[PDB]
Structure formats: C-alpha cells, structure tokens
Design a protein around this ligand. Structure first.
Ligand SMILES: COc1cc(C=O)ccc1O
Ligand SMILES: [Fe+3]
Length: 480
C-alpha cells in the first residue's frame, strides 16, 4: 500500500506491520538467570494508510511485542491486536475508521462499531493479555499464543462504553482497578469506577460525573480511594465538527483532583473535589494515604505536552513549558474547602513515563523510575535520552544516558523474587538505536542503573514508538 509522505509515516515513523518470532536474540553482557517471564509492550503501527491525508501517532493500530526472558535468553514474538477495527479493515482491504477519536470521519459502513486500536497498553491480568485503549472496552488476548479473543464486555455486565488503558492492581485484594470516561458516549461527563477480581469478574461499576469532559488518561489508587486528576486537555463534538483534533489544551481552566471512595454504593456526594490553578499532568507515578493526607505524585508541566492536541486559543506549542517534573499533589481530607495542601516539586530532572515497583501500588513508595529529558546532553540526530531513578528516601538521583544517537522507551520494573524488598530487581526497557535503524532491549539492576545495563539484547527489527508495557512471571502467562 502507498502511505502518506508526512512526518507521521516516515523516518522513525515508517510503517512496520511485522508479525514475527525470533528465538534467543543476540546479546552483549549477561541476561540474569533469575528472570523467568515476559515483558509485553505495544506500538501503534497502522495496518493501512489513513482515510485522511495524515494521522497522528496515537492513532495507529496496536501491535503487541513480547520479550520472553528465561534461562538466560530472550525470545521475541510480535502479533497484531486484532480489534474489531483491525478485522473490519483487513476484510475490506482499506481504512474504514478515520481521525483520532472522530467518528464524523469514519466510513458509514462502520457506524456504531468499536473504534479501538488497542494501542496504549499491553497489560497482564487474570491469565489474559489486555490490549487497551481508553475509548473502548479492552481487547483480551492469550498471553502465550498471543491470539486475540475479543473485547472484554464482562459478558454484557459492563454498562459503560469504555475502559481505561492505565489499570492499577490493588495489592491487598488483587483486584484490577479501572475507570472508563466518556462512559455514555463521546465527550460526555460520565465516568465509571470499576474493579475486576483476579478471576476476571466485574465486581463493581459505579457511575459518577466529573467537572468537565477531558482526557482522563491516568489516575491513582490508595488503600481506600481512587484519585482522579481533571486536567483541561478538553474535547467536544464542536471541535470534531470544526475539523479540529479531538483534544486541545485550555490554559484558562482550573485543574481538579477527585477523591472517590473504593467501596460499593458510592454516590456522587461521597466524592470530594480539590481545585488548583491550571497546569498539565498526564501520568501518575503512584498515590498513597498518610494520616489525613493523600499524596498524588504526577509528572507536572506548566503547559500542554501534546503538540498534536494544540492550545485551544491558537497559541504555538511552547516546548519549554512542556517540561514535566515529578511533583507531589497533596490534599487533606480533614481540611475544609477545595485548596490543595501542597504542590511539591520532587526533582529538577525533567521526567515522564513514571514507574514504581507495582507490588506497592497505593502504598508509599521509596523508589521511582522515569524517562528523562536531559537537554544538556549532546544530540547527533521532547527527547527522552536518559533512564532516571529517584530514591525518595535519600534523595539520591541516578541517570543513565543512552548516548547521542539513541532514545528510550518506557521502563518496567521486574522484582527479583515475590518476597524481595521494594525495588530489588531489574529494569527492562526498549532503546531506539536511531542512527542504526534498530532496537535494543536493555536490562538494568534497578537500584544501580548508573553503571549501565547488565545486558544489551539486540533486536534485528526496528521497533516503533511505544506506549505502556508490563512484566509477568511465566506462571502467570502460561509459559512456566
Ligand atoms: C496511544 O494512544 C494514546 C496515548 C495517550 C498518552 O500517552 C493518550 C491517549 C491515547 O489515545
Ligand atoms: Fe499513558
């Protein structure tokens, strides 16, 4: 097929569309024997040229990559997430769905069909692989064969239209905790709060409303709460009619933080809202309670981080104000009123794609890992050029730079053992070797990243820009 000659489909964004298997990837260093499981990640990767003249990265069909690490080797498997969209377009031999989150640009033949590209997260839970996209139910897949089952509607018990791509697992119960925004239709202010049992049952679905419709991409959990930030990357049917990108950022609107009790029967009046001045924040490191306080650690920037979802008043993109920093939003459930108790910048390092040791989700975490944008580094080819580790107890920061002709994808923490202390284990992440037109899988000792990866695993396929990824042990994915 003939693709557009635009930035979104050329250079590093050239279509790939590869399904493949490789056993025992070539490598340098020592692949830890203690690793026995798989790292899953997803790349948007268009099956077909777009209906319109161009498209954005976030709109490519989900392609799932798995690195099966066992016995000191890494195996590679890559398969399409076969969404209803993928299936319909494959049968038709052409694109049928149009622009990002814009049904007004779809072929009439797919009116009412689920638009998901399943391209934002590759998550393992309850014996299934979840290929996730926040405008639709999640797509479920076999974690071992990587065949596709279909969309998870919980047998029809789910009443909302959508399911998050940023699920959290409650370590106390083992439940998956989820939201679904635009729950009653596009651009609506309805949201569902959901929990899924380890057995796969939808055990709670609570409807509530938020102050305004916006991209509710991420959220936090604590022991007793779901913590939902409301940030004004807004959308509307009018934007779609005016031919605009679905979302745009409004610098004039306030930011809110909603505290939802994680219990049956929660009502709107049970939800508490705090309010602060405008800023941008997308990803959540973690959240926790401490006394009467809630700590909500996010990567906060002064202004919009999505150039493709532009300022609603026409301002050009401000790269400097797009620099995000780990920041603790502190609210006090024992205060009166809506003010935050604190907004505390936690590092001067510019950072995004925050990760923790997920075994400690919703508890106070000593450690965090991030992708860092070090604008002081040489570049010989915004730029994510360092892995960054913060020890929040000691304050110590570690940085590893991938060099001047590379960039990095989201890290993932892998525990050494089920009983290991927080952070005792490894970091895995994809590295884009931009000049060599190829990719590496890097494995680090998670509490000593600054010495560099202990293994560099060569991938003889150029991987595309990725979103979120996750590790599962072999006995959780049918590979033991
Ligand atoms: C890859 O798709 C998306 C990614 C994000 C943020 O990283 C937000 C909405 C999306 O649809
Ligand atoms: Fe995300």
């Amino acid at each position: 097929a003939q693709f557009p000659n635009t930035p979104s489909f050329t250079g590093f964004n050239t279509p790939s569309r590869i399904e493949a298997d490789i056993a025992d990837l070539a490598h340098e260093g020592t692949i830890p024997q203690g690793l026995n499981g798989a790292f899953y990640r997803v790349q948007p990767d268009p099956q077909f040229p777009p209906r319109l003249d161009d498209d954005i990265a976030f709109n490519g069909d989900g392609m799932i990559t798995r690195f099966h690490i066992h016995d000191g080797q890494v195996d590679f498997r890559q398969r399409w997430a076969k969404t209803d969209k993928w299936k319909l377009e494959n049968a038709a031999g052409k694109a049928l769905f149009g622009a990002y989150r814009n049904p007004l640009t779809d072929d009439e033949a797919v009116k009412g069909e689920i638009r998901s590209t399943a391209n934002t997260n590759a998550f393992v839970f309850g014996g299934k692989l979840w290929a996730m996209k926040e405008d639709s139910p999640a797509l479920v897949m076999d974690p071992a064969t990587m065949e596709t089952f279909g969309f998870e509607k919980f047998g029809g018990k789910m009443t909302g239209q959508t399911f998050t791509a940023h699920p959290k697992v409650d370590p106390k119960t083992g439940n998956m905790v989820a939201i679904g925004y635009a729950a009653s239709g596009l651009c609506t202010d309805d949201v569902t709060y959901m929990e899924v049992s380890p057995e796969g049952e939808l055990v709670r679905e609570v409807w509530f409303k938020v102050p305004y419709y916006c991209m509710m991409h991420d959220f936090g959990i604590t022991e007793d709460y779901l913590v939902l930030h409301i940030v004004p990357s807004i959308g509307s049917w009018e934007r779609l009619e005016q031919g605009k990108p679905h979302f745009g950022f409004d610098t004039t609107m306030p930011v809110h933080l909603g505290i939802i009790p994680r219990r049956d029967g929660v009502r709107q009046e049970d939800i508490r809202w705090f309010t602060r001045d405008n800023c941008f924040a997308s990803h959540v490191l973690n959240a926790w309670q401490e006394g009467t306080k809630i700590h909500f650690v996010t990567c906060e920037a002064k202004n919009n981080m999505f150039p493709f979802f532009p300022d609603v008043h026409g301002a050009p993109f401000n790269g400097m104000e797009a620099m995000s920093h780990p920041t603790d939003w502190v609210v006090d459930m024992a205060s009166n009123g809506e003010d935050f108790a604190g907004i505390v910048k936690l590092s001067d390092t510019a950072a995004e794609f925050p990760r923790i040791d997920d075994r400690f989700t919703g508890q106070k975490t000593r450690h965090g890992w991030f992708l860092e944008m070090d604008m002081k580094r040489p570049v010989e080819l915004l730029l994510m050029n360092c892995l960054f580790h913060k020890d929040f107890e000691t304050g110590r920061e570690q940085h590893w730079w991938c060099g001047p002709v590379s960039s990095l994808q989201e890290p993932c923490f892998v525990p050494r053992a089920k009983d290991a202390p927080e952070g005792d284990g490894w970091i895995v992440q994809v590295c884009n070797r931009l000049e060599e037109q190829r990719s590496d899988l890097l494995i680090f000792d998670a509490l000593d990243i600054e010495k560099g990866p202990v293994a560099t695993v060569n991938i003889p396929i150029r991987l595309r820009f990725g979103l979120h990824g996750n590790w599962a042990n072999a006995d959780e994915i049918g590979l033991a």
